[PDB]
Design a protein around this ligand. Structure first.
Ligand code: CL
Ligand code: CL
Ligand code: CL
Length: 495
């Protein structure tokens, strides 16, 4: 009696590197021992020795084999070293066989854990890039057709072995050097402030490339035995929050594009509150009367952006926020990535208009906020997001007019640089631009910005759990932007 089995030959999984060729996921040959239980069952006297070699409990091992006595294949140990494998084969236990497999290892470990993600016990991607690019990376298994007896041993092949085709190499957009910098500074900020979680995204505003994307807590993908759910969250891509004051720049972009506001136009925000029906809008800083558009950003005046929003209508604000991708499906095709929500109310009442304009009327991810700021930095042109290295840059879409984008860039440079501004976000050597806010989901300190002002190269978002924006997250923007700019050999623009 017979059977014909088709056997899959494992294909070498494609190498993942960072944009510079540094190894992030490597399929490395391992020896895994498997057994044909029908054969093993004829050599029970060998089991205890086999089990000792496997460092396995004799009872559990024996039970597992008896449990599987009618199967022709089970694994004994996977991902051993060649040496260790041969140690066991030398035992010459009937029904024990060795095969070359490929096991994934992650050389950068926790540093790029969430972005790279990892594979299953079957070498199929299950988080991050490994998941998103599985087909590119996996290649195609080879096939043997094997004639087997009822033991069931291989009698012969019944056709030519069809060799596996290796997966393809993949270079990420991530620059491991920037990734590491962001990773460490985020972590220090958390430790200092007694906060539990945070994210940090760095984008190339010219190419759409995600140069860094780090979250805390994080985890070691090479050892996932004591994992906790909170550590596995790729927060940059899956935590959503109301961005608050960080989207005022997009509200201002609508104001400018409306034809009705110039940067130097004034709004009276005294006495720092504004009664809307039953509701009261309140500024945190309430020592202002007249503020120009830049002053509204500096003071984070909710009252101010609200009065502007009442003037230009929420539709225009919605349109800018949508075009820059806030709450939109600019997804890179990572299963599970969040889109957030930018409700198209179509007609907004005062309350909703105001709440949208000062950023508590939408939810976004850190990645969208970074991409939005990248378009702004890129003279209003949005280059499509990428987590893989971009050699041929796609044409951008003009989502904010170049003139409005340049104008808002200048205002944001002032919130960082001007008196009463977010001085802690200043980056020595460069003109930096950006905006603080308090995100809500539970509050988080936010800072979002880009640099250098004169020919922006990167956009960055810092999100930190708050047990304020300009106090907690701003100094992190400063330090990380200071490092990243220099890592990219960006010439200092403060001359
Ligand atoms: Cl593991
Ligand atoms: Cl959630
Ligand atoms: Cl490309």
């Amino acid at each position: 009696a017979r059977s014909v089995r088709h056997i899959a030959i494992p294909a070498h999984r494609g190498l993942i590197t960072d944009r510079n060729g540094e190894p992030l996921a490597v399929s490395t040959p391992v020896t895994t021992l498997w057994a044909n239980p029908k054969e093993l069952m004829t050599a029970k006297e060998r089991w205890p020795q086999l089990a000792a070699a496997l460092g396995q409990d004799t009872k559990l091992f024996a039970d597992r084999i008896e449990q599987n006595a009618e199967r022709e294949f089970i694994y004994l140990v996977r991902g051993l070293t060649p040496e260790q494998g041969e140690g066991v084969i030398a035992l010459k236990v009937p029904g024990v066989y060795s095969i070359e497999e490929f096991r994934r290892f992650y050389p950068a470990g926790e540093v790029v854990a969430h972005a790279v993600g990892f594979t299953d016990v079957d070498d199929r991607g299950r988080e991050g890039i490994e998941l998103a690019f599985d087909e590119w990376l996996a290649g195609v298994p080879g096939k043997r057709q094997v004639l087997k007896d009822r033991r069931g041993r291989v009698i012969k092949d019944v056709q030519v072995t069809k060799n596996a085709k290796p997966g393809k190499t993949l270079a990420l957009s991530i620059d491991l050097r920037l990734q590491y910098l962001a990773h460490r500074e985020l972590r220090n900020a958390l430790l200092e402030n007694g906060a539990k979680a945070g994210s940090l995204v760095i984008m190339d505003v010219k190419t759409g490339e995600i140069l860094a994307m780090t979250n805390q807590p994080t985890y070691n993908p090479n050892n996932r035995r004591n994992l906790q759910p909170a550590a596995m969250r790729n927060r940059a891509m899956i935590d959503v929050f109301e961005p608050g004051s960080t989207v005022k720049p997009f509200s201002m972009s609508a104001a400018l594009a409306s034809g009705r506001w110039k940067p130097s136009d004034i709004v009276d925000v005294y006495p720092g509150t504004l009664q809307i029906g039953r509701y009261t809008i309140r500024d945190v800083s309430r020592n202002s009367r007249q503020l120009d558009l830049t002053g509204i950003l500096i003071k984070s005046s909710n009252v101010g952006i609200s009065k502007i929003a009442f003037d230009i209508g929420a539709e225009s604000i919605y349109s800018v926020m949508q075009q820059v991708g806030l709450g939109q499906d600019t997804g890179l095709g990572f299963p599970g990535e969040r889109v957030g929500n930018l409700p198209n109310h179509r007609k907004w009442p005062k309350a909703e208009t105001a709440t949208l304009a000062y950023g508590y009327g939408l939810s976004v991810t850190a990645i969208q906020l970074a991409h939005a700021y990248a378009a702004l930095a890129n003279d209003g042109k949005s280059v499509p997001l990428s987590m893989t290295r971009v050699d041929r840059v796609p044409d951008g879409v003009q989502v904010i007019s170049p003139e409005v984008a340049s104008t808002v860039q200048g205002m944001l440079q002032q919130v960082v640089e001007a008196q009463g501004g977010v001085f802690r976000a200043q980056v020595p050597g460069y003109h930096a631009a950006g905006k603080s806010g308090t995100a809500r989901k539970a509050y988080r300190s936010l800072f979002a910005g880009f640099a250098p002002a004169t020919d922006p190269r990167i956009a960055m978002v810092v999100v930190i759990d708050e047990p304020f924006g300009g106090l907690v997250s701003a100094p992190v923007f400063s330090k990380v932007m200071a490092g990243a700019l220099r890592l990219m050999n960006v010439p200092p623009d403060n001359l």
